[PDB]
């Protein structure tokens, strides 16, 4: 689970405590770590193991199954045709990356930026961002026209970070959108961008 962080002490501490017998603390450091060194080389009670194998197989499915948060977004600076799906109505979703580089946000954020992204964005090039992310729904037909989705991005640059990267979706249903002076005029949705949250 690539949790390249706690692993050392963290688990060990709780472990010993539950054993009662001894009061950690006074456990020389070569001891606690060495204790892991030995632990990491054993099987796993079928029970225990058997379950993790299960969680991992469905892991993916859960993550995209949620209501808040989708995996990454795409920028193409190419007027694009908004798609339509029975559930969200008229929205800009993409069920598949393929045709645009992938940039592990996790990788970037954790390791600082070299602006590779900064250059691609600047000379305005097709690019994708992957991982879990914030989220924003909007009903402002107008919005789309204002090309809001191509905004949010500039941000990042400033200082590293990338937490403040709420992207945008346009839940434009033929209803709850006071903004409907749309289907009254011959026309088609020009979204400059869309997102990965696969359909429930």
């Amino acid at each position: 689970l690539n949790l390249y962080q706690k692993k050392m002490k963290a688990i060990v501490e709780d472990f010993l405590k539950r054993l009662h017998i001894f009061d950690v603390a006074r456990v020389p450091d070569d001891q606690m770590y060495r204790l892991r060194d030995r632990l990491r080389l054993l099987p796993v009670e079928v029970r225990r193991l058997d379950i993790f194998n299960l969680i991992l197989m469905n892991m993916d499915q859960i993550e995209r199954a949620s209501d808040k948060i989708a995996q990454g977004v795409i920028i193409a600076y190419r007027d694009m045709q908004l798609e339509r799906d029975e559930m969200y109505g008229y929205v800009n979703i993409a069920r598949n990356l393929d045709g645009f580089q992938q940039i592990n946000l996790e990788e970037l954020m954790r390791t600082g930026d070299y602006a590779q992204i900064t250059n691609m964005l600047l000379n305005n090039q097709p690019v994708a961002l992957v991982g879990a992310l914030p989220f924003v729904t909007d009903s402002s037909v107008i919005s789309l026209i204002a090309k809001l989705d191509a905004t949010v991005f500039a941000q990042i640059v400033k200082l590293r970070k990338v937490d403040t990267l709420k992207p945008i979706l346009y839940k434009i249903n033929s209803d709850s959108n006071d903004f409907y002076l749309v289907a009254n005029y011959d026309w088609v949705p020009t979204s400059t961008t869309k997102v990965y949250k696969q359909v429930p």
Binding site: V46, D50, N53, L54, M57, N96
Partner: protein, 397 residues
């Protein structure tokens, strides 16, 4: 490539270990591997065929996975699984066949088909697993540039060759001296004949020799060597060297004298056997040299004396011979042998689908032609093609 392999051992160890009843904890380690696959696949499109009489079937992926619960397996579990396997089987078959016909002068050792080229892709490597099938085993060890090796019962190292050489002849062909032989597969039979029964020969002995150069080195060969060449022990009417007439061969057989077999490697004698008939070992050689003599019998009963006069006509032709058979051996290069179906599988798939002759292999995958001019390109293509045939035979026979 290696990718491909897995796909099968996956299915085999699958269509095998997944039966109504078995306990789950026997497949826990397996089940996993399986699913892992489906995932990597789903979302991919393929295409096979397009050549000769080979259909162009298209494939897509979109499958659910498998429960993990259940102490034991219920019939229902299987059937919902078998249904998914059958699509992969019918798939691989088409995948194998599609890459089992194309040949490339250049990189006849690399993937060809649009189907496979896509597999060597990195995103698919997450599927490799259990490479113990003798062929793949050797495919790897080679890709890493190391010492390969295979096993063959009655290997097929000798291109068919049946001929003779007249060392002494004349128009009437009534007093010939020479040798005739048959080299084919793993066997050699050679006879030395002297119509005069060495009557005017020094020490009344006529020397013979037969040399056979293998196109590939054979190591650890178990060989049967026997005196006499039964194939050349009967009366024959043969065409003359120039094809203009026919001569008569009327053999009478004597024991080969001073038999010496040498198994040489790059001109060096590695093994030598003097008059030893039965089972002998030749551990590493690229050439076999058989030397033997016809010695006129110094003492003859009347019946024998009558066959060998001091003057022509010579009506009974003194003949000595040898028979050598390579029962088993190891070769660093793939070869056809008497047990493996690889050559037959490749040849059969190409014939069934009317695959056009290509730039590498001889028409009909003819073995004699192939082994006679066993170029590096033919060997690399043959190995690729044999390895695929072996992957296919794990599921489809």
């Amino acid at each position: 490539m290696d990718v491909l392999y897995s796909l099968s051992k996956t299915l085999k160890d699958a269509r095998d270990k997944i039966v109504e009843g078995t306990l789950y904890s026997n497949v826990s380690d397996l089940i996993q591997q399986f699913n892992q696959m489906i995932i990597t696949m789903n979302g991919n499109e393929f295409q096979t065929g397009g050549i000769g009489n080979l259909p162009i079937r298209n494939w897509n992926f979109d499958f659910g996975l498998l429960g993990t619960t259940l102490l034991n397996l219920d019939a229902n579990y299987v059937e919902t699984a078998r249904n998914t396997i059958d699509y992969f089987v019918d798939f691989v078959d088409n995948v194998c066949m599609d890459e089992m016909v194309r040949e490339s002068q250049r990189n006849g050792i690399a993937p060809q088909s649009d189907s496979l080229i896509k597999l060597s892709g990195i995103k698919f490597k997450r599927i490799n697993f259990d490479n113990s099938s003798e062929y793949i085993e050797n495919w790897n060890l080679q890709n890493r540039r190391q010492r390969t090796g295979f096993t063959f019962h009655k290997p097929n190292i000798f291109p068919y060759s049946a001929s003779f050489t007249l060392n002494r002849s004349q128009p009437a062909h009534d007093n010939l001296m020479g040798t005739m032989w048959l080299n084919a597969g793993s066997e050699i039979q050679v006879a030395g004949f002297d119509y005069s029964c060495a009557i005017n020969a020094p020490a009344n002995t006529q020397q013979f020799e037969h040399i056979v150069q293998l196109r590939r080195v054979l190591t650890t060969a178990t060989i049967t060597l026997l005196p006499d060449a039964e194939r050349f022990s009967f009366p024959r009417v043969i065409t003359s060297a120039d094809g203009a007439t026919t001569w008569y061969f009327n053999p009478v057989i004597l024991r080969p004298n001073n038999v010496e077999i040498e198994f040489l490697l790059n001109g060096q004698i590695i093994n030598t056997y003097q008059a030893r008939f039965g089972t002998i070992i030749a551990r590493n050689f690229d050439t076999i040299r058989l030397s033997f003599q016809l010695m006129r019998p110094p003492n003859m009963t009347p019946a024998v004396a009558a066959l060998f006069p001091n003057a022509q006509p010579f009506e009974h032709h003194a003949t000595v011979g040898l028979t050598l058979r390579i029962e088993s051996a190891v070769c660093e290069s793939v070869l056809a042998d008497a047990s493996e179906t690889m050559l037959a599988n490749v040849t059969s798939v190409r014939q069934e689908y009317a695959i056009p002759v290509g730039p590498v292999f001889p028409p009909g995958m003819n073995w004699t032609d192939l082994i006679t001019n066993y170029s590096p390109s033919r060997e690399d293509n043959l190995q690729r093609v044999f390895t695929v045939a072996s992957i296919r035979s794990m599921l489809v026979k």
